Amino acid sequence: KHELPPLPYAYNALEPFIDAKTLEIHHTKHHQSYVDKLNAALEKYPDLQDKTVEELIKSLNELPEEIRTTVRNNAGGHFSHTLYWNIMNPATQEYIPEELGNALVETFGSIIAFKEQFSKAAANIFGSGWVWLAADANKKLKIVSTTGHDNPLMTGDAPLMVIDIWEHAYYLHYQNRRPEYIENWWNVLDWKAVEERYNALG
Amino acid sequence: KHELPPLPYAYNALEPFIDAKTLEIHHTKHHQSYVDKLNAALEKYPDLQDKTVEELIKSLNELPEEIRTTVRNNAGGHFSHTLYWNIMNPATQEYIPEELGNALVETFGSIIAFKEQFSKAAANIFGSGWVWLAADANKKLKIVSTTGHDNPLMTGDAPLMVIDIWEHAYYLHYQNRRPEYIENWWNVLDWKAVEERYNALG
Ligand SMILES: [Fe+3]
Ligand SMILES: [Fe+3]
């Protein structure tokens, strides 16, 4: 049975960039519910309780039709919120590690250029979705926009970082001012965590 | 140039079912934006500036590809928000007009049965979307769920009423408790307006 991972920090630890109430609801209501709903679907097909969230996402078309959609949405949700919590950290002096910084500069023109493109893709999401940094099988980086809780695992890629652009992520403190939310979010991005995932790809 | 119609009632008029702040922002920021965005997409195409939001939606596939998506989304948005404001009114005593009442009973089992199925479809929306009551060429009724600002004009149907299930519609007062928002919304549904649209279909 999958379980809601605790946040690596307190509900009020990302203030003022993300408000405490949101963080608490975002985790204990929105994320919790993806877990609950994933759990209930897999209970009908227990042989799938032994799969990782990621191998579920990558094998959607082999799951029974009955639950395929629930899983795509809810495993997607669980996975995507898990990454989101884990690549944020209480506001720390920005230091980008060399390996990740160099790759960003090589790919986009500079750090600022990547931030701009990422910010812009996030501003341009229509409806509920996410904006990712992701690597392909060959460690090539791209910025990816997705709808719902779809994600790059589905297109055979390795997610490195992501921002939640569902309105629930920012409405209580920013209402419609999503760009202000995106700009604030950079202050709690944990580059160290992003580096870790990058590095692990070898 | 398309314009933002004013609300048919005060910003505080749907309290406590819909809060004033939401109404202000939902209208002056979110709705305004679909208008502004629609206008900007049409700037290069004076031949299309003469068309109604509805004939734009009906002609998506024939529009220039450059703007097809922006129009779908922003005409969709304009149209859908416009109906939404206009099918709400300050909370009064429920009176459902006979023609509409009879059709609902004939189609669903009873009024309560229709409210249940409608409420349920709205509760089960994944992501950003809307739930509609809609009529076909023959005034047969159905409940339709859509994603984004997609809408039943796209399937050749006549929209009668709709509820906005984007999170911005309800997050400030209900946060994650969408069912509570759905339940409260029935109190300000203007059945007379719904009847009027039904009646017009002959
Ligand atoms: Fe979220
Ligand atoms: Fe809306």
Residue numbers in the entry:
A (entry chain B), B (entry chain A): 2 to 203
Could you share sentences copied from the article?
Here we studied metal-preference evolution within the natural diversity of the iron/manganese superoxide dismutase (SodFM) family of reactive oxygen species scavengers. Only a few metalloenzymes have been rigorously demonstrated to be cambialistic in vivo, including some iron (Fe)- or manganese (Mn)-dependent superoxide dismutases (SODs; SodFMs); metalloenzymes that play an important role in cellular reactive oxygen species defence. To study this process, we leveraged the existence of naturally Fe-specific, Mn-specific and flexible Fe/Mn-cambialistic SodFM homologues, which differentially utilize these metals to catalyse the detoxification of superoxide. By combining phylogenetics, biochemistry and structural biology, we demonstrate that SodFM metal utilization can be evolutionarily fine tuned by sliding along a scale between perfect manganese and iron specificities.
CPR Wolfebacteria represented a striking and highly unusual emergence of dimeric Fe-preferring SodFM1 containing SodFM3/4-like HCterm and VD-2 residues. SodFM1s and SodFM4s were found in uncultured CPR Wolfebacteria (c). Although SodFMs are a well-studied protein family, with over 50 WT protein crystal structures available from various organisms, we were able to uncover additional diversity via application of bioinformatics and phylogenetics on a dataset of genomes sampled across the tree of life. This included the novel categorization of the SodFM protein family into five distinct subfamilies, the first comparison of multiple members of the largely unstudied group of SodFM4s, and identification of atypical isozymes such as the Fe-preferring SodFM1 from CPR Wolfebacterium. In some cases, such as Nesterenkonia alba SodFM3 Q/H, a single residue has a major impact on the preferred metal co-factor, while in others, such as CPR SodFM1 H/Q, mutation at the same position had a negligible effect. Importantly, consistent with previous reports, comparison of four protein crystal structures of the WT and mutant SodFMs we determined here indicated that metal-preference modulation by XD-2 and Q/H occurs without any significant changes to the secondary metal coordination sphere within the resolution limits of the solved structures.
